[PDB]
RNA sequence: UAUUGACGACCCCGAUUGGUUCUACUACAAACG
């Protein structure tokens, strides 16, 4: 699952939020202008673009403060295992030795598709019922691959530069990144392809939250959550970043503008 | 001989899929629209996720892993019956009985007959579906013949290329929870989509394969206490703040939606009441079933299903008999078993 | 000093390709001309620190040592995408 | 004038976006008390 993956869904559900509290619509913006929303702008990073403001001249680019890393399976293959199954021609044929072998149950085609499960879909014509011709297509659906944690890096540091050193700028980006691990853990935001269409929900089980050098107030950060609901997070805490956040609200300024 | 119009000059501009993003309908927003014919798309409103079986023993094994029972024939169909799958008019009226084939895709000013559907096989009896291995085919065990298997021919299984057959079935009463996430539905689309998930008793939908033999009759209703439905406003409120915030209580609303839904409907295909909308009442049908009591299987000129199968000279005797076509389905009208 | 280090991909896989799309945040679609492709050298990847220091001070630097520290730490990025998955 | 007489599967992916925007040399050492 690139990273470029993980990084757009979580960008698309703090822009989301950001948009619905202040009631913005994305729907006459250009993709670059629907990107550039504040906080997301610190955080996710906004692409490189000198502007003239007056006289003055200034990047509106900055790198994202967060970066995602690629995720990977705890299921591996050989090179010429996936091979195998990338080059098979038929699915009840030489698909299913390839299949077998790459999830490793060679003697075990049940086992097997409780890994990696092809699955045939048809559009069915409104009329006549049926199929609709050529609408006949076919997934391999990795129904029970298991998958490493995702790694989430704030740059607390990039991000306290952005605030021109001011820690107490940090607590409403930290706040929008609570809240869309709110979402993430809550199943509001599916990975991948296919979301709408069978695919693409996620169980988040354990969040770990593991900072070095944070800032004194941030320091409550340093937990490992199990409730989806943050409620692991003391309360106190979420109280201080709530109204942090509270007050962004009242009044979203461009909180890296001084 | 050749119909002179083809079945897409029959249908409105206004009901084939959309080409660009300004003719979505409600279900191309609702679930989301691909142009099949250039440049355009939309992200669904509304994920399915999270299904899950509750039953353990959900898969009628019919009595060891390699029993299968032989299913009936699934066939394909055919709008060349224009008496079936052609409309009088663009409300989707039937054909009109006793008309020559040359009728059918004959005019402009004809109509497809719409949206297939299965209606629900209402009053299959006790032992239906129970030990479907049995040939029961051909026996009236209560009125009703095993519709659903393929006959033996000759005391022997027909296991032929024209029918499939199956290792196993999801048993009936068996129970599956899943979870639909809508967005930026309005109380219109919403209510649309509430009112199939709280249809009243004895309606019921139809899902999977084998839906012309009896498969697929499902009951879905709302759980209320895991829905979380709010506007806007009330997300505003919930990422207003870290801390647990209480949720508004959809069950006082869902009434109102399904009549905003009601009322559009009332309103948009003028009618006095929303239940006598004609796709309304035939939709209910469907879900419902027929009421008659008539058995509902392919058209056969024969009680049984004999084993040769035969269906195709019920189309013979209703050529030269009545030439019936399909009723309609708010009608619930039956055909007989002899056209003639 | 820094030398040029050539990339030795393990075995010898061949570069992988990775496909990217801006999706847009009206639609939840594909945005139009935002389709592009990155070639990525794998994973597990060898290249050498070709690194020279020359000292007119005695010893070693400590901002010296806390850079191969911050090495062996894995937290030096390199190349594009350093936010989006790579480097 | 309406008879002859039963067999038989099909669909196998389809449509689209395929790069977009910014940075394009900057200070120097030779000039100038």
């Known amino acids: 699952i690139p990273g470029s993956s993980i990084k757009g869904i979580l960008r698309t559900q703090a822009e989301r939020i950001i948009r619905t509290i202040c009631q913005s619509n994305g729907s006459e913006k250009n993709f670059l202008e629907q990107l550039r929303i504040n906080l997301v702008n610190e955080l996710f990073g906004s692409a490189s673009l000198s502007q003239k403001q007056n006289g003055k001249d200034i990047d509106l680019g900055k790198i994202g403060a967060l970066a995602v890393n690629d995720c990977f399976s705890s299921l591996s293959m050989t090179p010429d295992q996936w091979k195998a199954v990338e080059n098979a021609t038929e699915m009840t044929g030489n698909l299913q030795p390839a299949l077998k072998q790459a999830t490793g149950y060679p003697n075990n085609i049940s086992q097997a598709y409780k890994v990696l499960q092809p699955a045939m879909h048809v559009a069915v014509d409104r009329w006549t019922g049926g199929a609709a011709e050529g609408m006949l297509y076919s997934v391999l659906e990795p129904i029970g691959v298991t998958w490493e944690p995702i790694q989430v890096h704030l740059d607390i540091a990039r991000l306290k530069n952005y605030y021109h050193g001011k820690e107490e700028k940090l607590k409403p980006a930290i706040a929008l990144l609570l809240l869309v691990l709110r979402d993430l853990a809550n199943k509001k935001i599916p990975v991948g392809y296919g979301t709408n269409r069978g695919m693409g929900t996620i169980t988040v089980s354990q969040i770990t939250l593991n900072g070095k050098a944070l800032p004194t107030e941030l320091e409550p950060l340093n937990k490992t959550m199990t409730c989806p609901n943050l409620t692991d997070l003391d309360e106190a805490f979420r109280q201080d970043l709530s109204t942090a956040w509270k007050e962004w609200i009242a009044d979203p300024i461009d909180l890296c503008q001084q | ?340 | 000093i820094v030398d040029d280090a050539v990339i030795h991909i393990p075995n010898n896989a061949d570069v992988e390709i990775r496909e990217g799309v801006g999706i847009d945040r009206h639609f939840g679609t594909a945005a139009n001309g935002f389709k592009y492709s990155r070639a990525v050298i794998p994973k597990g990847s060898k290249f050498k620190l070709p690194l020279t220091f020359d000292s007119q001070d005695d010893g070693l630097p400590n901002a010296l040592i806390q850079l191969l520290c911050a090495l062996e730490a894995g937290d030096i990025r390199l190349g594009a995408a350093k936010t989006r998955g790579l480097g």
């Open chain 2, 1 to 340: 001989g050749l119909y002179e119009i083809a079945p897409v000059d029959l249908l409105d501009e206004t009901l084939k899929p959309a080409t660009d993003k300004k003719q979505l309908s409600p279900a191309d927003r609702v679930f989301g629209w691909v142009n099949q014919r250039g440049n355009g798309c939309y992200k669904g409103q509304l994920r399915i996720h999270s299904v899950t079986c509750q039953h353990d023993d959900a898969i009628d094994d019919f009595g060891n892993q390699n029993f299968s029972v032989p299913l009936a024939i699934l066939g394909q169909p055919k709008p060349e019956q224009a008496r079936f799958y052609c409309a009088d008019d663009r409300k989707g009226i039937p054909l009109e009985d006793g008309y020559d084939r040359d009728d059918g895709y004959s005019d402009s000013e004809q109509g497809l007959r719409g949206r297939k559907v299965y209606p629900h096989h209402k009053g299959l009896p006790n032992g239906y579906w129970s030990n479907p291995t049995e040939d029961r085919s051909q026996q009236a065990i209560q009125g009703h013949y095993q519709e659903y298997r393929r006959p033996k021919k000759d005391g022997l299984e027909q296991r032929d290329d024209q029918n499939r057959s199956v290792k196993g079935w999801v048993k009936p009463l068996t129970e599956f929870t899943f979870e639909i996430d809508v967005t930026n539905l309005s109380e219109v689309e919403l209510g649309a989509l509430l009112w199939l998930l709280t249809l009243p008793d004895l309606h019921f939908h139809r899902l999977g394969g084998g839906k012309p033999l009896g498969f697929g009759s499902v009951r879905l209703d709302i759980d209320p206490d895991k829905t979380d439905l709010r506007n806007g406003a009330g997300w505003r409120d919930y990422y207003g703040s870290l801390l647990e915030t209480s949720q508004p209580d959809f069950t006082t609303l869902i009434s109102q939606w399904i009549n905003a839904f009601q009322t559009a409907v009332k309103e948009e295909y003028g009618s006095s009441s929303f239940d006598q909308v004609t796709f309304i009442k035939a939709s209910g049908q469907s879900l419902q079933g027929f009421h008659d009591n008539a058995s509902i299987h392919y058209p056969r000129s024969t009680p049984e299903p004999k084993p040769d199968g035969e269906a195709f000279k019920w189309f013979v005797a209703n050529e030269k008999g009545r030439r019936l076509a399909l009723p309609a389905l708010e009608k619930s009208q039956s055909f007989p078993i002899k056209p003639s």
